[PDB]
Amino acid sequence: SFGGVSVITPGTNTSNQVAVLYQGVNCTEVPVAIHADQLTPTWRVYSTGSNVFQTRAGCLIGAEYVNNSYECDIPIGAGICASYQT
Amino acid sequence: QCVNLTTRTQLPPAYTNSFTRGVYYPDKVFRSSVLHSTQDLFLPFFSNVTWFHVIKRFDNPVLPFNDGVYFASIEKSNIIRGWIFGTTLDSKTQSLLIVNNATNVVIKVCEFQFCNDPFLDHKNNKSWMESEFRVYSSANNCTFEYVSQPFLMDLEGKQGNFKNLREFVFKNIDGYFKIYSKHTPILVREPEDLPQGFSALEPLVDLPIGINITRFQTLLASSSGWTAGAAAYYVGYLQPRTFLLKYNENGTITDAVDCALDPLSETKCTLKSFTVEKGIYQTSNFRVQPTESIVRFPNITNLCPFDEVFNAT
Amino acid sequence: QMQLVQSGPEVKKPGTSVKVSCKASGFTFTDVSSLQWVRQARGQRLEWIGWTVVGTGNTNYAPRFQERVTITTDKSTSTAYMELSSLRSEDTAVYYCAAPFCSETSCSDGFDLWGQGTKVTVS
Amino acid sequence: EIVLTQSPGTLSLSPGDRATLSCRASQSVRISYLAWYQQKPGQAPRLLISGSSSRATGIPDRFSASGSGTDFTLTISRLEPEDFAVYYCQQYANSPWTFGQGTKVEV
Amino acid sequence: RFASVYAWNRKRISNCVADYSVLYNLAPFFTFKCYGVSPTKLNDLCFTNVYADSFVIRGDEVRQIAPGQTGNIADYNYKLPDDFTGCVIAWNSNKLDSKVSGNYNYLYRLFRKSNLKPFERDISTEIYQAGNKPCNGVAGFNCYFPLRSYSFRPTYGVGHQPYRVVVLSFELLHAPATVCGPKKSTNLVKNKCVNFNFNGLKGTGVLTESNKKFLPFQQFGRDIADTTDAVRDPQTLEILDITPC
Ligand SMILES: *[C@@H]1O[C@H](CO)[C@@H](O)[C@H](O)[C@H]1NC(C)=O
Ligand SMILES: *[C@@H]1O[C@H](CO)[C@@H](O)[C@H](O)[C@H]1NC(C)=O
Ligand SMILES: *[C@@H]1O[C@H](CO)[C@@H](O)[C@H](O)[C@H]1NC(C)=O
Ligand SMILES: *[C@@H]1O[C@H](CO)[C@@H](O)[C@H](O)[C@H]1NC(C)=O
Ligand SMILES: *[C@@H]1O[C@H](CO)[C@@H](O)[C@H](O)[C@H]1NC(C)=O
Ligand SMILES: *[C@@H]1O[C@H](CO)[C@@H](O)[C@H](O)[C@H]1NC(C)=O
Ligand SMILES: *[C@@H]1O[C@H](CO)[C@@H](O)[C@H](O)[C@H]1NC(C)=O
Known part of the structure; x- marks a missing residue:
């Protein structure tokens, strides 16, 4: 199994908290691969982070999913945009 | 003279996170006002180092070693003095002898038959002196001899107010001995945990001796029993990592980051900058490493008639 | 398969010498493997003669066989030779060569493999 | 310099029964350098x-x-009719090796 | 006398001038191939440190000293790294090492638990146990001696004569040099387009004064393009500053 990794970040001064997207993967594929010497990125702690929301571009970890609507801030893909709010 | 004193006492250790310590100069070149990305063996940021405390204690094992580990001591009394490296201590495998008593710095690689515990600690009750100098017995074929200036020593010993903080990372590359060292006399506090800050590690002994390090001891400084003062020393292990290093205009390292700590640091070193703006950034890929090896070749095991062809009448 | 082979029974005459071989295609001499030689007479207890090391070439003989037997091992041809001299009627018996299945550093304390033996008789 | 004696000398037991045999020496003690053999x-x-x-x-x-x-001892749980043979005890540790005299089992 | 295979000596060559003419002038030097350099350009470069390794091996195993070679002497006795820089010299020495009565003072490993990484240090001669059972004391069954002695006699044909071997290894131009070649210095010229040759560096430019502070273990300066632009004069230790015409 192979793929891509993207990082969702607000400005560095604004905060130091991020969200990570796994491109084009069913969200149950990555939790299995959480073991030492098994993933190229070594920061597998994040995979067991915040609640996972599955999208058409892959599930993103570390950001929650509200159901109201705002203006797009950071475009995720297929009708989803992330933002830094209260 | 040496004594089989034995009567060793041991206590459970502690754990402490090393914040940012353990950064040294990778190469022998002068760069200024740049950002340089280097892959090498480093101490990972926010790693867990094993803290040890000495009052009524006696420890001298080998440091679990892979051509380099990190060792940081907070002291005032200047207990640790010299270096003795050896794999069998049998006068067959040439053993090190690095000695700096007051001002001399003698390096000698020679076959040695040492004692059980080469100790300079024990001699004349409270008082300290350079006793047990002849820890070795025979010096048949000694290769290298060299004299240089010593470290910043402390006269006699002082209990408490441990201003001095010595950091040593041990290795040696291509035979070049490299015990990188940094001695800062800045501890305005109790020992407690390791301090917070940044400081590089110049190679203090970058010298062509030649042999490598795999099992050794560090020399700690009547002939039985002692009541020493308080001291603390910390042990940490290195791993292969990629670091981004910043040089200021004066040519010295100011700040650094490691790629493989957090996604934030990952994109920081992908963009080759210390600040990232709001957005979405693509970074290293996502692979799964193989877990084992399998080999399947055909079952038959005969001998191909090669000598008949090659050595016929 | 993993089994040793040997020559056939032989008949000799007094005042002569023989060479006995245990070249086997079912076993690899390699460098750690060693083999011993045993002799079986007609309804008699087995007696140990000697065993030799392929790698270091060291031998080990009986206290009474330092005058008429020589043991040598050739790794290139993967064989073991004994030169036997002074063959009387008491030396007519069946010879066996034994060597454990020992490849590289892995092998046990017993000689599992066993040659069928050659019947040497001298009149 | 080691002499091995195997006991009992002869046996005659019904097939399928449990039997045990022993061998004895006079030299130093060793358990890992002993082997048992059957010759037909x-x-x-x-x-x-x-x-x-x-x-x-x-x-x-x-x-x-x-x-x-x-x-040294060996035990056979059942005497299936093909096991009627002679046993040999062999040691390795000491001076040049020597076998035993052999124990023959009868029907 | 040269040391055994399993105790190769490592000699210090530093703070002197090396002339390779006499080295390459010896008639019986045959297996002389160099990897990182060319053998005729050893007299014009400065090396930071030079090491020499001496051992005597059989003729059939001289080919095992090339880097990356696999075998039985290149796994338990002496292994060269894959990034070797320097070169080896080998020549027959059947005249001296061999003896009429038999010389048996050359040894080498026969067994080992595992192979050895390049140059990693050891001598221990403890017994090696083939079987799973632990063996101690002396030799016997499934526990042997890991040493065998060479037999060097004139009766042996080609392929068994002793072959004296020496290996030279050295880094290249990343530290204050100590071993140099025979060359003649001159007077330094300031603020003039010249053709400098600073301890191995050939370039063109004008040399000025610089204020940047070099630590005692540094000799070269570099910039973003990764080209040298500040060098320290060997003879007199001020810091210059290289800029093109
Ligand atoms: C820090 O980032 C914020 C992002 O909104 C910016 O407004 C501010 O000017 C920055 N401060 C700096 C770069 O010192
Ligand atoms: C992931 O796989 C499960 C199991 O087959 C399936 O039910 C689900 O539809 C898949 N999700 C996506 C986003 O493809
Ligand atoms: C939207 O989410 C809130 C909680 O996050 C929930 O109470 C509400 O029912 C959701 N609305 C719909 C239409 O599902
Ligand atoms: C301790 O005793 C051992 C065994 O007698 C001996 O080998 C060793 O040299 C002794 N060491 C000291 C320091 O007396
Ligand atoms: C690492 O150090 C922290 C800080 O005290 C501690 O809480 C944690 O238990 C340590 N973990 C391990 C595995 O030692
Ligand atoms: C180091 O050697 C010098 C030269 O003899 C001597 O003056 C000095 O006292 C020595 N240091 C000691 C003995 O601690
Ligand atoms: C110091 O040690 C020496 C040798 O061990 C001894 O002769 C002397 O009496 C001791 N002196 C004191 C004050 O302990």
């Missing part, structure tokens, strides 16, 4: 157990080793 008429001897602690290739669990001292 017209066939080379075959190995049964080595070192009194492990089995060879293809050896069924019938042969069980025992003994912790200088004595």
Whole structure:
């Protein structure tokens, strides 16, 4: 199994908290691969982070999913945009 | 003279996170006002180092070693003095002898038959002196001899107010001995945990001796029993990592980051900058490493008639 | 398969010498493997003669066989030779060569493999 | 300089019964350098157990080793009619090796 | 006398001038191939440190000293790294090492638990146990001696004569040099387009004064393009500053 990794970040001064997207993967594929010497990125702690929301571009970890609507801030893909709010 | 004193006492250790310590100069070149990305063996940021405390204690094992580990001591009394490296201590495998008593710095690689515990600690009750100098017995074929200036020593010993903080990372590359060292006399506090800050590690002994390090001891400084003062020393292990290093205009390292700590640091070193703006950034890929090896070749095991062809009448 | 082979029974005459071989295609001499030689007479207890090391070439003989037997091992041809001299009627018996299945550093304390033996008789 | 005696000298038991045999020496104590063998008429001897602690290739669990001292013992749970043969005890540790005299079992 | 295979000596060559003319002038030097350099350009470069390794091996195993070679002497006795820089010299020495009565003072490993990484240090001669059972004391069954002695006699044909071997290894131009070649210095010229040759560096430019502070273990300066632009004069230790015409 192979793929891509993207990082969702607000400005560095604004905060130091991020969200990570796994491109084009069913969200149950990555939790299995959480073991030492098994993933190229070594920061597998994040995979067991915040609640996972599955999208058409892959599930993103570390950001929650509200159901109201705002203006797009950071475009995720297929009708989803992330933002830094209260 | 040496004594089989034995009567060793041991206590459970502690754990402490090393914040940012353990950064040294990778190469022998002068760069200024740049950002340089280097892959090498480093101490990972926010790693867990094993803290040890000495009052009524006696420890001298080998440091679990892979051509380099990190060792940081907070002291005032200047207990640790010299270096003795050896794999069998049998006068067959040439053993090190690095000695700096007051001002001399003698390096000698020679076959040695040492004692059980080469100790300079024990001699004349409270008082300290350079006793047990002849820890070795025979010096048949000694290769290298060299004299240089010593470290910043402390006269006699002082209990408490441990201003001095010595950091040593041990290795040696291509035979070049490299015990990188940094001695800062800045501890305005109790020992407690390791301090917070940044400081590089110049190679203090970058010298062509030649042999490598795999099992050794560090020399700690009547002939039985002692009541020493308080001291603390910390042990940490290195791993292969990629670091981004910043040089200021004066040519010295100011700040650094490691790629493989957090996604934030990952994109920081992908963009080759210390600040990232709001957005979405693509970074290293996502692979799964193989877990084992399998080999399947055909079952038959005969001998191909090669000598008949090659050595016929 | 993993089994040793040997020559056939032989008949000799007094005042002569023989060479006995245990070249086997079912076993690899390699460098750690060693083999011993045993002799079986007609309804008699087995007696140990000697065993030799392929790698270091060291031998080990009986206290009474330092005058008429020589043991040598050739790794290139993967064989073991004994030169036997002074063959009387008491030396007519069946010879066996034994060597454990020992490849590289892995092998046990017993000689599992066993040659069928050659019947040497001298009149 | 080692002499081995195997006991009992002869046996005659019903097939399928449990039997046990022993061998004795006079030299130093060793348990891991002892091997047991069976030789059949017209066939080379075959190995049964080595070192009194492990089995060879293809050896069924019938042969069980025992003994912790200088004595060496072997036990057979059932006497299937093909096992009627002679047993040999062999040591390795000491001066040049020497076998035993052999124990023959009868029907 | 040269040391055994398993105790190769490592000699210090530093703070002197090396002339390779006499080295390459010896008639019986045959297996002389160099990897990182060319053998005729050893007299014009400065090396930071030079090491020499001496051992005597059989003729059939001289080919095992090339880097990356696999075998039985290149796994338990002496292994060269894959990034080797320097070169080896080998020549027959059947005249001296061999003896009429038999010389048996050359040894080498026969068994080992595992192979050895390049140059990693050891001598221990403890017994090696083939079987799973632990063996101690002396030799016997499934526990042997890991040493065998060479037999060097004139009766042996080609392929068994002793072959004296020496290996030279050295880094290249990343530290204050100590071993140099025979060359003649001159007077330094300031603020003039010249053709400098500073301890191995050939370039063109004008040399000025610089204020940047070099630590005692540094000799070269570099910039973003990774080209040298500040060098320290060997003879007199001020810091210059290289800029093109
Ligand atoms: C820090 O980032 C914020 C992002 O909104 C920016 O407004 C501010 O000017 C920055 N401060 C700096 C770069 O010192
Ligand atoms: C992931 O796989 C499960 C199991 O087959 C399936 O039910 C689900 O539809 C898949 N999700 C996506 C986003 O493809
Ligand atoms: C939207 O989410 C809130 C909680 O996050 C929940 O109470 C509400 O029912 C959701 N609305 C719909 C239409 O599902
Ligand atoms: C301790 O005793 C051992 C065994 O007698 C001996 O080998 C060793 O040299 C002794 N060491 C000292 C320091 O007396
Ligand atoms: C690492 O150090 C922290 C800080 O005290 C501690 O809480 C944690 O238990 C340590 N973990 C390990 C595995 O030692
Ligand atoms: C170091 O050697 C010098 C030269 O003899 C001597 O003056 C000095 O006292 C020595 N240092 C000691 C003995 O601690
Ligand atoms: C110091 O040690 C020496 C040798 O061990 C001894 O002769 C002397 O009496 C001791 N002196 C004191 C004050 O302990």
